[PDB]
């Protein structure tokens, strides 16, 4: 496919004084557009966007039994009150329950985790830093371009995993349903390297078109987090894709 | 299973002067709650709620190739403008594109259609009335209780169909997503045989629980149609489900 730099979205970044990048790819034309070709190829910690490949690997290895698996809370204190409950796979992904996925990673183990990230061509494929924290504070890095490539493979069932397991994760990622479109997406917030990085990645099925997207931005403080969704949402609204 | 009458729900019906039934089942269809025991098991034409089994059967028979199938519009008139476009499986379900599903039914054919309705224990399993219209004006009938049983089977991947195909149809049925809950659903409106019936069937996943539901009502006219969703929505909001 192709990628082209544009300027028609810059106003959305400058209006909020944000440094960031949006990559948007139309499946049928095999064409992507981005406001910043350089930043589109810059590689950052995936943070909770890593729950996508982790969920798939968890399923593929049998660590996660199926889509009806309940991840029970043991009662031990968690970093967030909202994680302190039993969760489904979709629930754990949607609330970004890190401890659930740290346990998954541990059970997958280094050898299998490495193998699957190679198969998925996932970022720099570097799982150094501890089996349960490599995507949060370790050496793993991925770009916005690589995110959209990965997500397109998931959409097409082309990852090295069963179609059934890819379908399970795809439904777990649904975040907005409308009669005219369906959005699958995942946020991330990497706080361990400076500048902190906010992600929103996913895809939109609209009419018979499919649009893959990846957004990241420097996050000055927590009050800026909603911009991870609002900036790319405005862009996609102006493109006639959603809303 | 068992079905228990809940008198309080009736309020949402009488307020609107509606004759109908809501069936709601927490966890499984072993025990369900309803406003009307008799009507819970009364059988009506499924109308476009039949697109659920029809889509599964289309996939199982290979009539629908896979989840990425595009149903091409030939450019000739269709009965609604919203149908006059290429559609995905989810698109055709969401806009209730009758002609796309009529073509699927024709290609499936009577023998295979009959076979799968028996496998799915789908209502009275009677497909008489024409291969492309039996769910619209034929002899096919299904109750709210049987809709919930069928949808529970789908939710559990227990229908006589591949897990892949059940997952494909389940994703096509998503109608509301929130971080805490997910709704899968389908509307129907039986117009050709009296009394006219409006349907809304589906399930809600909230926290670690699942709720199966089926609603139907007598429809006096077009203006009453929104009540198919609003009455059961209000009941489900009142139970803390959505």
From TrEMBL, chain B:
Catalysed reactions listed for this entry: a beta-lactam + H2O = a substituted beta-amino acid
A GO biological process held by the record: cell wall organization
Binding site for Mg(2+): 220
InterPro entries in alphabetical order: Beta-lactam/transpept, Beta-lactam/transpept-like, Beta-lactam_class-D_AS, PCN-bd_Tpept
EC numbers, comma separated: 3.5.2.6
Key words, A-Z: Antibiotic resistance, Hydrolase, Metal-binding, Plasmid, Signal
Any one GO molecular function term: metal ion binding
A Pfam family per the record: Transpeptidase
Disulfide bonds: 25-32
Penicillin-binding protein transpeptidase domain residues: 39-237
Domain of life: Bacteria
N6-carboxylysine PTM sites in chain numbering: 51
GO CC terms of this entry: plasma membrane
Catalytic residues, chain numbering: 48
Signal recorded as keyword: yes
Family: Belongs to the class-D beta-lactamase family.
Protein name in UniProt: Beta-lactamase
Organism: Escherichia coli
Lineage start: Bacteria, Pseudomonadati, Pseudomonadota, Gammaproteobacteria, Enterobacterales
Gene label: blaoxa-10
């Amino acid at each position: 496919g192709s990628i082209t730099e544009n300027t028609s979205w810059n106003k959305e970044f400058s209006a909020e004084a944000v440094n960031g990048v949006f990559v948007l790819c139309k499946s049928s034309s095999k064409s992507c557009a981005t406001n910043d070709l350089a930043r589109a190829s810059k590689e950052y910690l995936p943070a909770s966007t890593f729950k996508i490949p982790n969920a798939i690997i968890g399923l593929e290895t049998g660590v996660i039994k199926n889509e009806h698996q309940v991840f029970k809370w043991d009662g031990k204190p968690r970093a967030m009150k909202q994680w302190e409950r039993d969760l489904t796979l979709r629930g754990a992904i949607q609330v970004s329950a890190v401890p659930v996925f740290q346990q998954i990673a541990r059970e997958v183990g280094e050898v299998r985790m490495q193998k699957y990230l190679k198969k998925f061509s996932y970022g720099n494929q570097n799982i150094s830093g501890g089996i349960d924290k490599f995507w949060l504070e370790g050496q793993l890095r991925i770009s916005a371009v690589n995110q959209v490539e990965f997500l397109e493979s998931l959409y097409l069932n082309k990852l090295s995993a069963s179609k059934e397991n890819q379908l399970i994760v795809k439904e777990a990622l649904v975040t907005e349903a409308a009669p005219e479109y369906l959005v699958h997406s995942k946020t991330g917030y990497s706080t361990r390297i400076e500048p902190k990085i906010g992600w929103w990645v996913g895809w939109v099925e609209k009419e018979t078109e499919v649009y893959f997207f990846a957004f990241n931005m420097d996050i000055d403080n927590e009050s800026k987090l909603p911009l991870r969704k609002s900036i790319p949402t405005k862009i996609m609204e102006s493109e006639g894709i959603i809303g």
